[PDB]
């Protein structure tokens, strides 16, 4: 079974492990961040949530890509393995020899 | 075939389906929420448009997900069916005994 | 192997072909668009940085989707060539006969 990781913020009620985006509001102040790489301020608040949420599909997508590596490698070993397919259904009982069903009867 | 959904806003000319993303322009009122759980205002419509796009996507994931899920459980099945590889190419003829390919010549 | 784009705006040290997002800081004009369609504007500079990581997640799924597609092809492959499964594993020797196993004994 695949084991993804849940969004952490979302536009609703939150369920377990995660919290309510904060839009916002009239009658809040109004600030941007006071560092030259920070993220504070309530202008920045709901565009960082989301950012959060994007950061987690990516990782999200990033498991599905290891999962599905292993099934195409999985897929190519199974090509490469080799295994033979039915021989006619006409009455007959064949055997094997150089990679062709062949007429048992030919040997009797 | 997979069916995934378009993403609903674009910042661009919209396709079937999809809406153009309003960013802030100059000259508008710049507005916030009046509940402590509502989105509307300017200062936070485009931010809610992206979002929107960032839950399509996460159902996107999901439906990838279950593809996935079901296409690791079909290899599993194929890897336990116990089908038979290939007798030797020497130009003599095998028969199955004990999982092995077993000369004929040795029963008659 | 699958390759996949990586996000073009982060919020943190930039890798190779990356850049970090600039949230709104205190201190700089609070400006918006002066088109109806553009997304020009201090305003909007971090959602349309968040926006275009969204819109390579969702290239990044359609890559996924199409390697999925070719993997759920393969496998009907597999599951239709027909290929046969093991014989008896009780000492006797068995050849192939209207899609079953059958005594070798019997036609000797």
Same mark, same amino acid.
Do not use: M
């Given at each position: 079974? /695949?084991?993804?990781? @849940?969004? &952490?913020?979302?536009?609703?009620? &939150? !369920?377990?492990? *995660?919290?309510?985006?904060?839009?916002?509001?009239?009658? #809040?102040?109004?600030?941007? !961040?006071?560092?030259?790489?920070?993220?504070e301020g309530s202008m920045n608040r709901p565009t960082?949530?989301?950012?959060?949420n994007v950061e987690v599909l990516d990782k999200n /997508?990033?498991?599905?890509?290891?999962?599905?590596?292993? =099934?195409?490698? @999985?897929?190519?070993? /199974? *090509?490469? !393995?080799?295994?033979?397919?039915? !021989? &006619?259904?006409?009455?007959? =009982?064949?055997?094997?020899? @150089?990679? #062709?069903?062949?007429?048992?009867?030919?040997?009797?």
């Open positions: 079974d /695949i084991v993804l990781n @849940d969004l &952490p913020f979302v536009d609703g009620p &939150p !369920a377990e492990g *995660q919290s309510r985006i904060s839009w916002i509001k009239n009658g #809040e102040e109004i600030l941007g !961040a006071d560092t030259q790489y920070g993220s960082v949530s989301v950012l959060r /997508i990033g498991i599905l890509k290891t999962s599905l590596e292993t =099934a195409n490698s @999985d897929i190519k070993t /199974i *090509q490469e !393995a080799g295994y033979i397919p039915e !021989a &006619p259904r006409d009455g007959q =009982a064949y055997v094997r020899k @150089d990679g #062709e069903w062949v007429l048992l009867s030919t040997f009797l």
